[PDB]
């Protein structure tokens, strides 16, 4: 319950149906602000910040504890348990999509549905598997993050947004710069050493995978791979927009998909 304040948990909206919104790298829960009004008349929406968000006291970031995504899963499950919520839908972006997958395997009855955005089970390439990055490529990135975080961040923000939407680049850059550089590097490293391919088949929750036209971190082939190997009923929704952060750059397009996906579960 101490976690509820530490991770800035907010519950808004009304009703029986609970929806958790879980953000990805470089933002906090405010990234959901524009799609949020489409959900709160019909749902009780739970928002929180990952421990690595700049909006969380850096005093709480335990490098050794958060060395794997299971620690993040522990936080999610602890929040839901403290709120006494036995059933929900879960919307996860990027690292939170991985967290959601792991959590649904841990507690199948708790997650009635998953919605995965900017999602991948593995961001590194492997033999015949296209994740998007070679080891050498991301190691070059990690070098840059470590040498000059500000310079790296300025370069990454428009790539992540993808589409030429200056306001989204500005907004993403804002929260990206709010992260402590060493925590930022650590979380990225944790994500890039994660590989969930082996356990996708264990998932039993129905799942919607949201695909954009181009994502610097998620090849177009990943969505079909997820659909093929996830063990529940999986549908790919195609979002007609470019980038990794459609909740920031194309909130109108995304919101309508979220509405359909969360109408019943």
From Swiss-Prot:
EC number(s) reported in the record: 3.1.-.-
Q: Which UniProt keywords apply?
A: Cytoplasm, Hydrolase, Nucleus
Q: Which residues bind substrate?
A: 94, 188, 244
Q: Which residues form a coiled coil?
A: none
Q: Upon deletion of the gene, what happens?
A: Increased number of tillers, reduced plant height, and elevated levels of strigolactones.
- Consequence recorded when altering residue 152 to A: Decreased enzymatic activity toward strigolactone and loss of strigolactone-dependent interaction with SLR1
A single Gene Ontology CC annotation of this entry is:
nucleus
**Tissues where this protein is expressed:** Expressed in the parenchyma cells of the root stele and lateral roots, vascular tissues of vein and leaf sheath, ligule base, auricle base and stem base.
Query: Self-association or partners: how does it assemble?
Result: Interacts with D53. The interaction between D53 and D14 is enhanced in the presence of strigolactones. The interaction with D53 occurs in the presence of (2'R) stereoisomers of strigolactones, but not (2'S) stereoisomers. Interacts with SLR1 in a strigolactone-dependent manner. Interacts with D3 in a strigolactone-dependent manner.
Q: What does this protein do?
A: Involved in strigolactone (SL) signaling pathway. May function downstream of SL synthesis, as a component of hormone signaling or as an enzyme that participates in the conversion of SL to the bioactive form. Strigolactones are hormones that inhibit tillering and shoot branching through the MAX-dependent pathway, contribute to the regulation of shoot architectural response to phosphate-limiting conditions and function as rhizosphere signal that stimulates hyphal branching of arbuscular mycorrhizal fungi and trigger seed germination of root parasitic weeds.
UniProt name for this protein: Strigolactone esterase D14
């Amino acid at each position: 319950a101490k976690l509820l304040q530490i991770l800035n948990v907010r519950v808004v909206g009304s009703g029986e149906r609970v929806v958790v919104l879980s953000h990805g790298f470089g933002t906090d829960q405010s990234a959901w602000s524009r799609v949020l009004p489409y959900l709160t008349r019909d749902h009780r929406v739970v928002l929180y910040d990952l421990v690595c968000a700049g909006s969380v006291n850096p005093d709480h970031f335990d490098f050794r504890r958060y060395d794997n995504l299971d620690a993040y899963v522990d936080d999610l499950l602890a929040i839901l348990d403290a709120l006494r919520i036995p059933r929900c839908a879960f919307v996860g972006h990027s690292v939170s999509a991985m967290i959601g997958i792991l959590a649904s395997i841990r507690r199948p009855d708790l997650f009635a549905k998953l919605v995965l955005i900017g999602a991948s089970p593995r961001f590194l390439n492997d033999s015949d598997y296209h994740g998007g990055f070679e080891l050498e490529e991301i190691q070059q990135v990690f070098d840059a993050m470590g040498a000059n975080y500000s310079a790296w961040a300025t370069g990454y923000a428009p790539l992540a947004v993808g589409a030429d939407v200056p306001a989204a680049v500005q907004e993403f850059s804002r929260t990206l710069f709010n992260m402590r550089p060493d925590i930022s590097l650590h979380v990225c490293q944790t994500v890039f050493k994660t590989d969930l391919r082996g356990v996708l088949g264990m998932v039993r929750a129905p799942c919607v995978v949201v695909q954009t036209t181009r994502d610097v971190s998620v090849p177009a082939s990943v969505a079909a791979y997820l659909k093929a190997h996830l063990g529940g009923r999986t549908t790919v929704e195609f979002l007609q927009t470019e980038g990794h952060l459609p909740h920031l750059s194309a909130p109108s397009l995304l919101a309508q998909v979220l509405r359909r996906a969360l109408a019943r579960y």
